Design a protein around this ligand. Sequence first.
Ligand code: FMN
Ligand code: CL
Ligand code: CO
Ligand code: MG
Length: 115
Amino acid sequence: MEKSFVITDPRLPDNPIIFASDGFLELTEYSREEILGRNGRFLQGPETDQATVQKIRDAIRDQREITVQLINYTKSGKKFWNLLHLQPMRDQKGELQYFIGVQLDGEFIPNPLLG
Ligand SMILES: Cc1cc2nc3c(=O)[nH]c(=O)nc-3n(C[C@H](O)[C@H](O)[C@H](O)COP(=O)(O)O)c2cc1C
Ligand SMILES: [Cl-]
Ligand SMILES: [Co+2]
Ligand SMILES: [Mg+2]
């Protein structure tokens, strides 16, 4: 599939998605109109590890890059493992401008060696 990514605007409330790639639409099964303006946490669900969610929270707060692997769900409820790479993007004035999150679908590291 084409690269799956979203870009969020941390200068707006709760870091909404302002761009979703065609690959993200394909991976998640959502349409662009179901995505724009919401927070990326919508892909989470019952099996998502909250310890991993906390790590993401801290990285966003600290404006630090992180990679985690966590369970996400398609629109039709199919579970997938998401190796999510989150990167802050700063402008030439040194100011945070965006986050980008790139999703790779797969259980890259076996679950027994995550937990
Ligand atoms: C650019 C960007 C992309 C994100 N992509 C995803 C994603 O693909 N899947 C996911 O579960 N969370 C994703 N998140 C994480 C959630 O948006 C959120 O930051 C996380 O769940 C921690 O915050 P919370 O505890 O308030 O939900 C993304 C965050 C950002 C900033
Ligand atoms: Cl966020
Ligand atoms: Co591909
Ligand atoms: Mg939550």
